[PDB]
Write a structure and sequence with these properties.
ssgcid; oxidoreductase; L-2-Hydroxyisocaproate Dehydrogenase, Chain A, domain 2; 39% helix; globular; alpha/beta; 14 strands; Rossmann fold; Leishmania major
């Protein structure tokens, strides 16, 4: 019954602000499970992190055993079982995707080295910050074989939850009845949102519906148009869902989208990528669900291969 | 059907922290669907549409519906719970009388709207400052349609801060600490009291609790949001679900018939137990300690035009 150590990077940012109270209240590891939060951000953010820590204290969360704030990944990751990687170099005006990938490669190499050096052997990692799939690949490869490749993932669950919700609104049904949308491929505009296997209760969703891909791909930009700011609440909620389903299991009959290491996948997607697939999770482990498709994936595969080359990988 | 919950100030930072907690079940529990009705000023309507979109994108199974509006009557239509985070923005070197009058405008209109269209048994907590006096304005402006026992002001953030500070000073987990009391006004005259506090089964503090909000602003450059949202959830949750045996929590409540000789006609923070949506003041936990906070609440009542 020792507290489970959970690291959150980018912890002075808006996703981190929305995420840490969910972890502390028990949404991640369960309502009985004590947690320790290890919060990482850049050195100029130390005072802001102290502010986050002070607010966490002021919540009087019964499960939150300890909070540590740091700018050193070797401190943040020390003994951690779960690492939620929100920190990343943000896209500035004038950057192409390649520029963003190159700014992020240094971050994720340092973090992957640190995780391999000091985290628990079985540490499970999810990358939220963009470009998420490639950042996760960089992280994994920087561990030089010391990190289980099945334990490094990238988050497509915000896109998945966006698609569940959209399908529910289009069908006029409660979102609680909708399952088994699939986001394939990259967490980018080449993602393939797929409703062909989706159901409402057990009814194929098509049979219940009397722009979908564009709306899902464009939703982040829509949030920015409305709010002036990127999604934070919903991203934090998705990161909790990604991890919670991974650790606790997906319920019977449900699969969820996860960016996972592609070696040995049942779809013939190239090896050596972090690629979003439909997954069940049982006993802390993902399994890709087969039979749900292939030419549909060519563009997102090609983009992931291009990014991997750009990563010097 | 879904319990209808209004949140005012819904385009602000407390609102942003609060609405996903409500939507995920933290307010009313794991089986109770909710409908959120989000109110802010008209210039904030686009921002509110962004909050609604993010709520949709969470795919919350308990969130049956979201409405966003700048019209209080639309926000409060049929609502059973109203969490009032919106208040007048406090200006640089503004007179306290002026601030109270400007808040009186807001809370009078909102109280009238609640009276007009909310459910008869609607429960209200005011978060936005000055919380106690704003709550009193709201109640008095409802001209009888609101049960006085159903209008409250939040001191739970101060209470949670005191629990945490006591646990830190004693070097124990905060889960072991209970029964701090915040008496009086949600202001610098609050009386943080540890005389009745328990650690387990076993029986600078004041300045630190009173100064905590300013400390957060120094560190973050912004007022508390996460912690205030969490406290709002705790205040309503404990009110509706009930407080566990042996636990009391601080709540600003209407002061008629209190057992402490505090004057009537105020919203005043007391130690309370709750059962099934009703608070009861816990007696015997003190009186001259309260004189200054009493006097400040009476002054604010008069300055508000009440």
């Amino acid at each position: 019954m020792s507290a489970v150590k959970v690291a959150v990077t980018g912890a002075a940012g808006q996703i981190g602000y929305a995420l840490v109270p969910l972890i502390a209240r028990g949404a991640l590891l369960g309502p009985t499970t004590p947690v320790e939060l290890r919060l990482l951000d850049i050195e100029p953010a130390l005072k802001a992190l102290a502010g986050v820590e002070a607010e966490l204290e002021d919540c009087a969360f019964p499960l939150l055993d300890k909070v540590v704030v740091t700018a050193d990944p070797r401190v943040a990751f020390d003994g951690v079982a779960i690492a939620i990687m929100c920190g990343a170099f943000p896209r500035k005006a004038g950057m192409e995707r390649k520029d963003l990938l190159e700014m992020n490669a240094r971050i994720f190499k340092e973090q992957g080295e640190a995780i391999a050096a000091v985290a628990a052997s079985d540490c499970r990692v999810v990358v939220v910050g963009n470009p998420a799939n490639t950042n996760a690949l960089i992280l994994l490869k920087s561990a030089q074989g010391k990190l289980n490749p099945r334990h490094v993932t990238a988050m497509t669950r915000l896109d998945h939850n966006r698609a569940l919700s959209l399908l529910a609104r289009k069908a006029g049904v409660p979102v609680s009845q909708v399952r088994n949308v699939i986001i394939w491929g990259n967490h980018s505009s080449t993602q393939v949102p797929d409703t062909d296997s989706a159901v409402i209760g057990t009814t194929p969703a098509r049979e219940a519906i009397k722009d979908f891909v564009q709306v899902v791909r464009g939703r982040g930009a829509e949030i920015i148009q409305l709010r002036g700011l990127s999604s934070a609440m919903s991203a934090a909620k998705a990161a909790v869902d990604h991890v919670h389903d991974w650790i606790h299991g997906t319920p019977e009959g449900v699969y969820v989208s996860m960016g996972v290491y592609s070696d040995e996948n049942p779809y013939g997607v190239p090896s050596g990528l972090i690629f979003s697939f439909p997954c069940t999770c049982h006993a802390g482990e993902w399994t890709v669900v087969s039979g749900k498709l292939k030419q549909r994936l060519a563009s997102t595969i090609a983009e992931l291969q291009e990014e991997r080359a750009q990563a010097g990988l």
